[PDB]
């Protein structure tokens, strides 16, 4: 048993390290892509040697990333053989697993290849419906889908989770037959720290979406509107919130697609955030008990005051009616009005007391 558990733990450690390295190399590729995209518009041309150097560096990172993913899946299959008592790796090779491995390699293989390739881009300007033709480099079509590499963050998050790796958690969850997967960890995080999860997701989406909007829009924007980073940030914020475009309509279908994706994400994230805030503005059960106690005390005091006023006004009416030789009708009318007011106050305060006793159950 000592060797059997140690082998699985060593395989877990190797697989976790491979995930960490894959995330490091994917993020390195994304960062160098962002730097090269920003700098080739300005500092250097696409025929410069700086462009070649940075894109060759991107391609080397991509090769290492693909190797790391393949070795990670080899370790996954080896762990599968260890777990499900198998001696042939070909048992693990279902159609679903092959398809997902191929999808992962396809997603992580897209990058701007070294070279100088251009294409013709035609778009209709917003609010003026005028055409715009530019000769755009192909590298933008290959750079934008590099943001799909962020699933490696989810992989690392699952593999570094304490729930997924702890022995106590596994032993307890075996009793309830809990399925320890990425969905369970995500739902647990949305349960304990919903505001933090939504905040991190929203800020990262905001920056990524604004940058990709300006990267797409800079080709047909010669007026510094949607190619402005701060303007793109504002556009993403107001489509997220569904206030709407101002004069900030994208000129390109890439920008429109990003804005649509932002609006779809916002339609749900806003409601989730509002539910979180509504829950956080609610009193705790102990605080509810204390508040009900203090309110009931105040209601009792007000009931006593109202009843005292009722009796006082009844006495005053009787006195000024059948006790004074000169019956002043104005005084009697005033006291009768006050008597009716006191009756109404007593009725209303008793209704409030009844409602509070209802919610106190």
């Amino acid at each position: 048993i000592g060797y059997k558990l140690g082998h699985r733990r060593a395989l877990f450690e190797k697989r976790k390290r491979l995930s960490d390295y894959a995330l490091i190399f994917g993020m390195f590729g994304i960062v160098v892509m962002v730097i090269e995209t920003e700098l080739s518009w300005g500092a250097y041309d696409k025929a410069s040697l700086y462009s070649l150097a940075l894109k060759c560096l991107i391609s080397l990172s991509t090769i290492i990333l693909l190797g790391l993913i393949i070795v990670y899946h080899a370790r996954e299959i080896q762990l599968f053989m260890v777990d499900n008592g198998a001696d042939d790796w070909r048992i693990a090779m279902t159609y679903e697993r092959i398809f997902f491995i191929c999808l992962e390699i396809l997603v992580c293989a897209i990058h701007p290849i070294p070279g100088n390739y251009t294409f013709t881009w035609t778009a209709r300007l917003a609010f003026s419906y005028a055409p715009s033709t530019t000769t755009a480099d192909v590298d933008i079509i290959l750079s934008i889908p590099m943001f799909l590499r962020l699933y490696l963050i989810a992989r690392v998050m699952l593999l570094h989770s304490k729930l997924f790796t702890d022995a106590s958690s596994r032993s307890i969850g075996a009793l309830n037959k809990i399925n320890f997967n990425t969905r369970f960890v995500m739902k647990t995080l949305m349960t304990i720290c919903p505001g933090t999860v939504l905040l991190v997701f929203s800020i990262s989406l905001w920056i990524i979406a604004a940058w990709t909007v300006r990267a797409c829009e800079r080709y047909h924007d010669q007026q510094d509107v949607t190619s402005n980073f701060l303007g793109a940030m504002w556009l993403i914020s107001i489509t997220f919130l569904s206030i709407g475009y101002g004069d900030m309509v994208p000129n390109t279908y890439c920008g429109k697609g990003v804005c649509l994706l932002t609006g779809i994400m916002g339609a749900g994230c806003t409601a989730l955030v509002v539910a979180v805030v509504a829950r956080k503005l609610e009193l705790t059960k102990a605080e509810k008990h204390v508040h009900n106690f203090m309110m009931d005390t105040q209601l009792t005091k007000r009931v006593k005051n109202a009843a005292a006023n009722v009796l006082r006004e009844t006495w005053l009416i009787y006195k000024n009616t059948k006790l004074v030789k000169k019956i002043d009708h104005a005084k009697v009318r005033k006291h009768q009005r006050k008597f009716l007011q006191a009756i109404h106050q007593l009725r209303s305060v008793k209704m409030e007391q009844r409602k509070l006793n209802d919610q106190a159950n």
């Binding site: 005091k301 009931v303 006593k304 005051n305 109202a306 009843a307 005292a308 006023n309 009722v310 009796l311 006082r312 009844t314 006495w315 005053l316 009416i317 009787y318 006195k319 006790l323 009756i343 109404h344 007593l346 009725r347 008793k350």
Partner: protein, 145 residues
């Protein structure tokens, strides 16, 4: 004067309480209706409510007694019932009477305080029997004649 339609409406309202055709609301039909209305009245409370409305002392509400009660219940608010409620606010433990000291304390401390001249002058004016403990009869007799 009431027409036939009005008498029919009041009769169906009476039937909403008179499940049994006894011609009178028993003291258990009121309990069943009140429990249907999300309440748990006690036997003492049920007897108190079934009283104060029956003038024949039979312990059961008739139709004319129901009409007399509805004469007050159809209003937005009733003065006598609310004076009785204000009386029961300070009549702890269902005593039926309030001591002069307690009444003076109530009228001087809580609520809009009276001047000490009118305090105990109210008690002197009340308590016609001279017992010294103010009953619910005196409070009703103040506002009424």
């Amino acid at each position: 004067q009431l027409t036939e339609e009005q008498i029919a409406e009041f009769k169906e309202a009476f039937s909403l309480f008179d499940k049994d055709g006894d011609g009178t609301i028993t003291t258990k039909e009121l309990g069943t209706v009140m429990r249907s209305l999300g309440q748990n009245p006690t036997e003492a409370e049920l007897q108190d409510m079934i009283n104060e409305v029956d003038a024949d002392g039979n312990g059961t509400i008739d139709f004319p007694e129901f009409l007399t009660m509805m004469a007050r219940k159809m209003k937005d608010t009733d003065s006598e019932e609310e004076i009785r409620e204000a009386f029961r606010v300070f009549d702890k433990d269902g005593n039926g009477y309030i001591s002069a000291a307690e009444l003076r304390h109530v009228m001087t401390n809580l609520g809009e305080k009276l001047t000490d001249e009118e305090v105990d002058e109210m008690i002197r004016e009340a308590d016609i029997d001279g017992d010294g403990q103010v009953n619910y009869e005196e409070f009703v007799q103040m506002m009424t004649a």
